[PDB]
Symmetry: C4
Subunit: 341 residues, 4 copies
Amino acid sequence: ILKTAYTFDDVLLVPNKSEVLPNEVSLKTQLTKKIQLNIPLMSASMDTVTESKMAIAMAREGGIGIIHKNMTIEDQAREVDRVKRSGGLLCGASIGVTNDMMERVDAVVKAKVDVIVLDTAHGHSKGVIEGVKRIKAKYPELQVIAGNIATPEAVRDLAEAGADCVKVGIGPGSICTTRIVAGVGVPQLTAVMDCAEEGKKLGIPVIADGGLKYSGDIVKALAAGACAAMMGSIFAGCEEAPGAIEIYQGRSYKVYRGMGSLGAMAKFVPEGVEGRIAYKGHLADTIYQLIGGIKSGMGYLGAPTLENLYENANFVVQTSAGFRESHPHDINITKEAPNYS
Amino acid sequence: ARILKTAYTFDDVLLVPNKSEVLPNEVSLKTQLTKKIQLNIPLMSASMDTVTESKMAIAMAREGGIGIIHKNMTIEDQAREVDRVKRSGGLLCGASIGVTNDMMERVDAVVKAKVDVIVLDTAHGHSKGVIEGVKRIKAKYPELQVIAGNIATPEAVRDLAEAGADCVKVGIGPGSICTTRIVAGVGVPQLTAVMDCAEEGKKLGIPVIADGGLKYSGDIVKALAAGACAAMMGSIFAGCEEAPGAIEIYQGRSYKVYRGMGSLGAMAVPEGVEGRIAYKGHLADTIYQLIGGIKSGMGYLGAPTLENLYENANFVVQTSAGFRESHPHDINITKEAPNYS
Amino acid sequence: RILKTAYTFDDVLLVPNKSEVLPNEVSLKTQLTKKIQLNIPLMSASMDTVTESKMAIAMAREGGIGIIHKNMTIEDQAREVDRVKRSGGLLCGASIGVTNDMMERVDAVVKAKVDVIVLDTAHGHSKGVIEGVKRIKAKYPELQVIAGNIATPEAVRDLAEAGADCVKVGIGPGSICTTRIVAGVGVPQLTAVMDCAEEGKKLGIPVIADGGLKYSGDIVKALAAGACAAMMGSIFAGCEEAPGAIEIYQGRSYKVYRGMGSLGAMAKFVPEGVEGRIAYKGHLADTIYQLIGGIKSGMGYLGAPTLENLYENANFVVQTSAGFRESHPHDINITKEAPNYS
Amino acid sequence: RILKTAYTFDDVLLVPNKSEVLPNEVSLKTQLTKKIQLNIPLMSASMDTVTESKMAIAMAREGGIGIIHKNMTIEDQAREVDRVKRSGGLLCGASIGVTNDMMERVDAVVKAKVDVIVLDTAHGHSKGVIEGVKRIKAKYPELQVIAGNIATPEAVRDLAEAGADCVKVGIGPGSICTTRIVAGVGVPQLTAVMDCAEEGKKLGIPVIADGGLKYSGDIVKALAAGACAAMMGSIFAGCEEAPGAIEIYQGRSYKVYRGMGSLGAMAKKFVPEGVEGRIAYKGHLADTIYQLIGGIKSGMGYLGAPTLENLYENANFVVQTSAGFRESHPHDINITKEAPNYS
Ligand SMILES: C/C(=N\O)c1cccc(C(C)(C)NC(=O)Nc2ccc(Cl)c(-c3nc(C(F)(F)F)cs3)c2)c1
Ligand SMILES: C/C(=N\O)c1cccc(C(C)(C)NC(=O)Nc2ccc(Cl)c(-c3nc(C(F)(F)F)cs3)c2)c1
Ligand SMILES: C/C(=N\O)c1cccc(C(C)(C)NC(=O)Nc2ccc(Cl)c(-c3nc(C(F)(F)F)cs3)c2)c1
Ligand SMILES: C/C(=N\O)c1cccc(C(C)(C)NC(=O)Nc2ccc(Cl)c(-c3nc(C(F)(F)F)cs3)c2)c1
Ligand SMILES: O=c1[nH]cnc2c1ncn2[C@@H]1O[C@H](COP(=O)(O)O)[C@@H](O)[C@H]1O
Ligand SMILES: O=c1[nH]cnc2c1ncn2[C@@H]1O[C@H](COP(=O)(O)O)[C@@H](O)[C@H]1O
Ligand SMILES: O=c1[nH]cnc2c1ncn2[C@@H]1O[C@H](COP(=O)(O)O)[C@@H](O)[C@H]1O
Ligand SMILES: O=c1[nH]cnc2c1ncn2[C@@H]1O[C@H](COP(=O)(O)O)[C@@H](O)[C@H]1O
Ligand SMILES: [K+]
Ligand SMILES: [K+]
């Protein structure tokens, strides 16, 4: 019980000397050794976040969407295929460890998915290791993301098993109760930091999944070493996300729930809650704001590229009081900001 | 420097997931309350007049745990309640005893009623009165299993072990209705207290119980992974139909009264308060949720048994920001979860 | 530079010790100064909305002591002290400021039988205060003098040298106090009381834990830190004895409670307290009973028959903000009034 | 990789020192640069809802200075500073950005006899600012230049070799600032001011504590950290002398206050780093300065400091926790009467 772990709100990045203006920087990243994204953002594989429409709009902005799997195998293959024939867009698919597994994989592969994500509550498990070894045995050159994990031991075991990228985050998500009902989890920033570090010794990239709420948070995840950030609530309020529209006190809300929530899984022991976030309009506007945030951050840090950002970033722990100084304070805000609230 | 040691409670820490060859539906929650008593699930209902009586203790045993009948009633009525449990078909049953002038007559009567365990529980278990009590009771009934409490230190485990106790209950002040820490200034945060006492207890070969301050199934997992043999809850069980006292309807919702035994109402200078808690229906639904959460955590930690969970658990400390990450956050929740208030 | 963290009461808990002593067994006698013993280590504040003759008569007869405030003329505070000393031989205190009329106020309250003088100012670690003590003891060598307020052991050392018989600790912890906010200056009270009690004891000088106390458990902590007695304002300001009529607001009664450095009490001012209302507490006896029982209960937990043994054998532990939440009642709709809680 | 905690005002307290001095005896004089002395170490911020000529005149007349903002055309800002120099030779500053017309704005305010310019930017530790400083001093070698904003000792050194006469510390503390939220970058202000003050005093360049101040006690902390002066927007933006009329909202008077990097101030392609809201009306600046000044004198008396230099040299800080914070503020009281220096 000696060691303290930090999440995003716990730290700040120290500005560096910069010869670089924000609209000079390049957010290109390697999602895997083979898959290059233009911007390091991906939409979560949840039934209230990503289907083909969201996945098409992520691809076009430079990112990628991971079509969720809470649908028939044939419907997912249709969603993926819908993305592929909308141009030449990259598309991912979610796969669980099931008796369905390889039929789901065969359908999205033939439908030309670019990357599958074997994601489960506990990526550091015998099922996932065997599942990655099974998939890569059948499809060697296909790209496999394995998650979710929180330790460097977990990185190696999935790298050994053949994953091309690992996905970090047990407990941080906005709709997640894993840490509350199971007691298990690692604060996300320290999780990404430790996993990024072992991932770089091995040649395997890591994704920061969950818990990001502002663009500043993504800068921290990338500075920690993640190759890409994945978000649910940040995208689930967008027009392209599936989700009934609910009305309350003059505002429109989009339904957003955990995949491990009662309503998603339908004696259940859930690991998620169901709720709603405010409608935010079109993805493109949300992406602009996030990219602009990341660019300014790299400007403050003098980083022309994501690699230089990771190599030159210096972190500083702020207290509860610093956290209050960091947010707007002692202001009665009256005009909406596309950046904040 | 007098103020050196920081002590932690459940909400300060998190468990790090291990490599798991095992699924939640395969782990065994069997535990030894004492050496002669083995429960199937490591949960006990608290010895309170708004929590455990014959109706509660019967249902606890039927789910695999134990209820300790409270002592706020005549010696006649207590023996009667223990007997109903004993005549309900071979169900384990406890009874609490205070440091009283009538003490050995209370032990007498519930022993006659074939009680399986007694709890000599006082505000301060590491005291002369409890020390002599345990030896006095071991002098008359050496076969009898006696739990003693409450305590907060490793020194207290020794002196209670050298006095005869077969188990020791940890918890000074963490209780949801408890004001001991505020009115007396005394106590140890529960996770550190369990941890320190579990470590002395294991070396000496005596189990410890985590009593008080548990609220979610994940907290229990932390207590068991800290080394407790079982967990005692008052608040988590007091809203159920089997707890004593009737339901109140206040503004469309159902509530039951829940009070500290040290509160003015139970005693008719108090160390607890009286209040109302939400009605939660039948015990079996609460037990099912708690059991499920515990097996989830043990799956995460790769633990087939409770002792293996303790051997291999690593804790990490989270800040206030980790805490807010760990709970659902930045979401308007619209559907109640059965495991997340 | 910044590095040493300083703690207040809600940052820490006392670890229970083995106890051969039941709460009704433990003794609460304490030495306020070398010449003044109290049966209980409680003092009421030198504030116009806390302590007058009625407060200080009531305080004495329960075994503590009241310190009559200075926010009144010299004649009337001497009479106030004479009110107390005539009512069956009780101890009385009196507040004295660093002023031009300061010896005349001392002279009056002395003729008026005052047992203890408190030369309390915003900054006791100061030339005026130190000179003031030296001048008073030179005129009255037997008169017991408390000086404050301070927060450092260097301040204990210097006020002991100046002739003080007891020093009062507390810069900023007060519930009505804005000193830390407007001047940026202070020390969390628990660490202040420890550091100063450490120095006062080596010199043989008692120290008072003054301000920031809200519950009985808080008092126990101050005493285990080595304070000789605890001074409270807010806890006593709600009582019948305290000065001030009882204003009532939406079917509930209250009493005015204000800082002595608030605009109200001092009437170009730059205040260092606020002014407000706190709920009516009842009679002082019942409030004191509940505080005594917490102390006695805390000493039971720590197995200390006396305040000295409690100081020597106390083990503090730091609690985080989640420990704090677990320490208070949680997740319960409290429906009945506990006599000793909120 | 992540070992250093950095602190802000609400995290620390100053420990009282033995004192031979009373608050009224204490001296508030500070060198804003080697060539500029203020009688009180307070500055109003160069924002379009804090400082124009009227507030620059009101600050100067109290012993401080105002920086007229640059969210206006060049001739208007030169006219604005000329209005202050006309009111009895008062001190005046003007804000200058890294623009295509940077040297032309500098020309107009120099013509109107501005005492100091502030080359203030999101990121003062940048090639732009570093080159603007060299180019401004090369043409106007006696002009006093403040450069900012910054947060590190490397930034202090590099801007001093650029020619800055004084630097301005503060990445993200402002009450209306979202830089640390949107960009993830910044340093808690007290640690920032301390680290930068230390390097400035080794090099001979003073530093300004800019942003995140809320109470007079906070100013004392920032001066004891070693800053030569404190810059405020929120504290002064409710005052009658700040720009914009007094607004009513549910029977209480308010004024508008917004970040310069907020949408309204920068007026879809924008990515703002500030917000816009409203703050309570607090009256005329004279009454706010009074309460501020008295708080600083009280703090310095507690510290036995007759000068700001003596305060920096003998100030001791302790960290307080959130419980310490809770004790530090008033607590467990229903405040009935409004205190002119608290809420
Ligand atoms: C993301 C997430 N939660 O973060 C989640 C998503 C859907 C469902 C669940 C539910 C509520 C069903 N909860 C678990 O699935 N909980 C859990 C707890 C412990 C372990 Cl060890 C495992 C594992 N399951 C596997 C399987 F192979 F089956 F996929 C390998 S390990 C699973 C959780
Ligand atoms: C209790 C308390 N505040 O806690 C208080 C009570 C009444 C008035 C004040 C006022 C509002 C007047 N505030 C100061 O008096 N502030 C202050 C600040 C710094 C110093 Cl150094 C001094 C000093 N006073 C003396 C005296 F001679 F008066 F004793 C020597 S030095 C005083 C404060
Ligand atoms: C669990 C608990 N509170 O957590 C509690 C439960 C019921 C009643 C009380 C009351 C309000 C009556 N409070 C004390 O009992 N307070 C107290 C304080 C200090 C000591 Cl040292 C002792 C002790 N009593 C004994 C006994 F005589 F019982 F054996 C041994 S030690 C007791 C407390
Ligand atoms: C104070 C402040 N925010 O705290 C602020 C004030 C006005 C406008 C902005 C906006 C919203 C436009 N935000 C940035 O300007 N952000 C930013 C982020 C990172 C860098 Cl590296 C730079 C730079 N700009 C330059 C310049 F072209 F001005 F010379 C050189 S470096 C700028 C911010
Ligand atoms: O029910 C759940 N329980 C726990 N985690 C979930 C659940 N559903 C989705 N997640 C994870 O939470 C992430 C979204 O987090 P968010 O962006 O913070 O809202 C997803 O990428 C998943 O990794
Ligand atoms: O009045 C009281 N004061 C302090 N502790 C109590 C009181 N009554 C019961 N307890 C303890 O608190 C536990 C209940 O805590 P809970 O599970 O957090 O609600 C019981 O098991 C007892 O160990
Ligand atoms: O106006 C004030 N400013 C600062 N401290 C004050 C003021 N008035 C009283 N005090 C101190 O605060 C103490 C009362 O604190 P309380 O019991 O927490 O309310 C008094 O004994 C004084 O030491
Ligand atoms: O939009 C903005 N983003 C970030 N900082 C700003 C912005 N506008 C003003 N500032 C800074 O914030 C300071 C005011 O902070 P305040 O005194 O806490 O209200 C000003 O001196 C500027 O340095
Ligand atoms: K801010
Ligand atoms: K205070």
